[PDB]
Design an enzyme around this catalytic site. Structure first.
Site, short mmCIF file in Angstrom:
data_model
loop_
_atom_site.label_atom_id
_atom_site.label_comp_id
_atom_site.label_asym_id
_atom_site.label_seq_id
_atom_site.Cartn_x
_atom_site.Cartn_y
_atom_site.Cartn_z
N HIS A 31 59.79 7.36 17.59
CA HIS A 31 61.12 7.81 17.18
C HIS A 31 62.20 6.75 17.30
O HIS A 31 63.30 6.96 16.76
CB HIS A 31 61.56 9.11 17.87
CG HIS A 31 61.94 8.99 19.32
ND1 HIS A 31 61.04 9.13 20.35
CD2 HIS A 31 63.15 8.79 19.91
CE1 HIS A 31 61.67 9.01 21.51
NE2 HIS A 31 62.95 8.81 21.27
N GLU A 55 53.65 9.77 18.74
CA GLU A 55 54.82 9.05 19.24
C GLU A 55 54.52 7.67 19.81
O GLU A 55 55.43 7.02 20.35
CB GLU A 55 55.69 9.87 20.20
CG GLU A 55 56.65 10.82 19.49
CD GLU A 55 57.69 10.08 18.64
OE1 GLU A 55 57.72 10.34 17.41
OE2 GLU A 55 58.45 9.24 19.19
N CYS A 139 64.25 4.79 25.54
CA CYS A 139 62.94 5.06 24.96
C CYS A 139 62.30 3.78 24.42
O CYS A 139 62.97 2.86 23.96
CB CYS A 139 63.00 6.16 23.89
SG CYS A 139 62.87 7.81 24.63
C1 LIG Z 1 64.57 8.40 24.55
O1 LIG Z 1 64.88 8.52 23.19
C2 LIG Z 1 64.74 9.74 25.25
C3 LIG Z 1 64.44 9.61 26.75
C4 LIG Z 1 64.51 10.94 27.46
C5 LIG Z 1 65.94 11.30 27.90
O2 LIG Z 1 66.88 10.61 27.65
N1 LIG Z 1 66.12 12.54 28.64
C6 LIG Z 1 67.45 12.92 29.09
C7 LIG Z 1 68.17 13.81 28.06
N2 LIG Z 1 67.31 14.89 27.60
C8 LIG Z 1 66.50 14.90 26.52
C9 LIG Z 1 65.81 16.16 26.39
N3 LIG Z 1 66.29 16.83 27.44
N4 LIG Z 1 67.16 16.08 28.13
C10 LIG Z 1 64.81 16.63 25.35
C11 LIG Z 1 63.40 16.13 25.61
N5 LIG Z 1 62.99 16.35 26.98
C12 LIG Z 1 62.14 17.49 27.26
O3 LIG Z 1 61.74 18.19 26.39
O4 LIG Z 1 61.84 17.68 28.62
C13 LIG Z 1 61.18 18.87 28.94
C14 LIG Z 1 59.69 18.56 29.11
C15 LIG Z 1 58.74 19.43 28.58
C16 LIG Z 1 57.39 19.16 28.73
C17 LIG Z 1 56.99 18.02 29.41
C18 LIG Z 1 57.94 17.16 29.95
C19 LIG Z 1 59.28 17.43 29.79
C20 LIG Z 1 63.30 14.62 25.33
O5 LIG Z 1 63.21 13.81 26.19
N6 LIG Z 1 63.29 14.25 23.93
C21 LIG Z 1 63.15 12.86 23.58
C22 LIG Z 1 63.21 12.69 22.07
C23 LIG Z 1 62.02 13.33 21.32
C24 LIG Z 1 62.18 12.90 19.89
C25 LIG Z 1 61.07 13.40 18.99
C26 LIG Z 1 59.67 13.01 19.53
C27 LIG Z 1 59.48 13.18 21.07
C28 LIG Z 1 60.73 12.79 21.87
C29 LIG Z 1 64.25 12.00 24.19
O6 LIG Z 1 65.39 12.35 24.25
N7 LIG Z 1 63.81 10.69 24.67
#
Ligand SMILES: *[C@@H](O)[C@@H]1CCC(=O)NCCn2cc(nn2)C[C@H](NC(=O)OCc2ccccc2)C(=O)N[C@@H](CC2CCCCC2)C(=O)N1
Length: 173
Positions: A31, A55, A139
């Site tokens: 991503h 990913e 990320c």
């Molecule tokens: C880098 O792009 C991001 C690093 C993570 C981050 O910054 N976390 C703090 C803010 N945040 C994001 C989310 N929640 N808070 C959404 C999601 N996290 C999540 O779902 O945690 C729950 C969980 C469930 C199962 C197992 C472990 C945890 C998240 O981190 N999303 C991610 C972007 C997605 C984009 C599409 C493909 C997969 C990642 C992100 O924000 N990463």
């Protein structure tokens, strides 16, 4: 401690970071990769072998891009219980390693996308109190661990809970 040469592999890329595994192999989280571009690091698409799934993105360049580097081992995650360091850099060049204890490798859905990944728990007792891993720019940062005198890379930062207490790296299948 991850040595300077290991940190020198961590490279600003897209909306996050990637990591040089060798002079020709660069890994990152899907991503964060720019779309609609004709080149990466000046090399045309026609000279790059792309392999991405779940990913995890790997680029293999036809030319040696980072001949300063040795090739190191990339593995699909690590044994449960391994303590990894997530090599987070910030824009100033400050190095902010994040210590994590790894759990299960699994396929999971995050924000509706398939992540083939490994979950882990932030080690409160091995990290300075402060937002490592919980901003978009973090990320792609690599998850590494030391095996003997060698460092191994085993994933790229993909997800974390709001608090950062639980993380996920994408891993190469
Ligand atoms: C880098 O792009 C991001 C690093 C993570 C981050 O910054 N976390 C703090 C803010 N945040 C994001 C989310 N929640 N808070 C959404 C999601 N996290 C999540 O779902 O945690 C729950 C969980 C469930 C199962 C197992 C472990 C945890 C998240 O981190 N999303 C991610 C972007 C997605 C984009 C599409 C493909 C997969 C990642 C992100 O924000 N990463």
């Amino acid at each position: 401690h991850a040595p300077p040469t290991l940190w020198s592999r961590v490279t600003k890329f897209g909306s996050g970071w990637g990591f040089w595994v060798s002079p020709t192999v660069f890994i990152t989280t899907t991503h964060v990769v720019p779309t609609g571009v004709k080149e990466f690091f000046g090399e045309p698409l026609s000279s790059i072998a792309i392999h991405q799934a779940g990913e995890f993105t790997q680029f293999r360049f036809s030319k040696k891009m980072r001949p300063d580097l040795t090739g190191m081992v990339l593995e699909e995650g690590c044994p449960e219980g391994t303590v990894c360091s997530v090599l987070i850099k910030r824009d100033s060049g400050e190095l902010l390693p994040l210590a994590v204890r790894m759990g299960a490798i699994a396929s999971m859905r995050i924000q509706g996308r398939l992540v083939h990944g490994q979950s882990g728990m932030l080690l409160t007792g091995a990290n300075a109190k402060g937002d490592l891993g919980t901003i978009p720019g973090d990320c792609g940062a690599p998850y590494v661990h030391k095996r003997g005198n060698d460092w191994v890379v085993c994933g790229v930062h993909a997800a974390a809970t709001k608090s950062g207490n639980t993380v996920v790296c994408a891993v190469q299948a």
